[PDB]
């Protein structure tokens, strides 16, 4: 929901009562992109029918490339109290890095509240993808570890292998659907 805001808020068109509609924004977001991709003349771009809300749009470029597009709201307020104990890097990357990161914004992605046997349509989920990126590229408490071979650790290597293990298994068993989620 939006707080008091005197001037006109242009996102008002996506409001439903007090609440910003994830459904409207996602629906319109892909509608805009759809109309616009038909104006891409040198590259053939096809839109996929949407299923979930984490990727708002999937674009299909010729016969080789796919692009998942995620829409996110940006908030520069202090992070919600529920994040207070998150970003548990204090003993890893340091409490001071944790503090620095938390002076940055957090994000909200249109996301229906997936639950036991159903979901809520206009919920938004907290997103820290930008922090995740910063961490992956600043995974050391030395913070420059791996940008120099003297301080080469395998955190990044282990993650790639872990991702690769899961991805390979998902590909291996994509047909048995066990691993789709």
């Amino acid at each position: 929901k939006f707080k008091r805001n005197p001037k006109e808020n242009p996102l008002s068109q996506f409001l439903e009562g007090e609440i910003l509609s994830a459904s409207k924004m996602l629906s319109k977001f892909r509608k805009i992109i759809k109309e616009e991709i038909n104006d891409i003349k040198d590259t053939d771009v096809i839109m996929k029918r949407k299923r979930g809300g984490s990727p708002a749009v999937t674009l299909l470029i010729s016969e080789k490339i796919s692009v998942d597009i995620t829409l996110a709201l940006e908030s520069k307020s202090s992070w919600p109290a529920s994040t207070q104990e998150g970003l548990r890097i204090q003993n890893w990357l340091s409490a001071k890095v944790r503090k620095q990161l938390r002076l940055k914004p957090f994000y909200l992605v249109p996301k229906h509240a997936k639950e036991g046997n159903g979901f809520q349509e206009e919920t938004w989920r907290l997103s820290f993808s930008h922090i995740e990126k910063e961490i992956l590229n600043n995974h050391g408490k030395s913070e420059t570890c791996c940008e120099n071979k003297e301080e080469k650790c395998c955190r990044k290597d282990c993650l790639k292998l872990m991702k690769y293990l899961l991805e390979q298994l998902k590909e291996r068993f994509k047909d048995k659907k066990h691993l789709d989620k």
Binding site: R4, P6, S78, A81, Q84, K99, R102, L103
Partner: protein, 94 residues
């Protein structure tokens, strides 16, 4: 020693609810103290007039409410009214 009153302690607490991870300089605090005393006087001052105008010896939640509407502009005035109205409703219920 003589002793002085301020809202410094209450200002800190409010800051924590909006920004749990931030602090405040001594000057900003001095300013917030100047601010609180200014607003207090105005509301109390206007409330005084309303009590006088309407022939009363007492200031109630209404005189405070009306003073707020007259002093504060647009919506800001409203939230102050909503919170006050509630706080009284609640105080006697708490």
């Amino acid at each position: 020693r003589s002793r002085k009153e301020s809202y410094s302690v209450y200002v800190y607490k409010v800051l924590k609810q909006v920004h749990p991870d931030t602090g405040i300089s001594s000057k900003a605090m001095g300013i917030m103290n100047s601010f609180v005393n200014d607003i207090f006087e105005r509301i109390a001052g206007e409330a005084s007039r309303l009590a006088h105008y309407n022939k009363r010896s007492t200031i109630t939640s209404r005189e405070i409410q009306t003073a707020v509407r007259l002093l504060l502009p647009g919506e800001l005035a409203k939230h102050a009214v909503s919170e006050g109205t509630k706080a009284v409703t609640k105080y006697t219920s708490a």
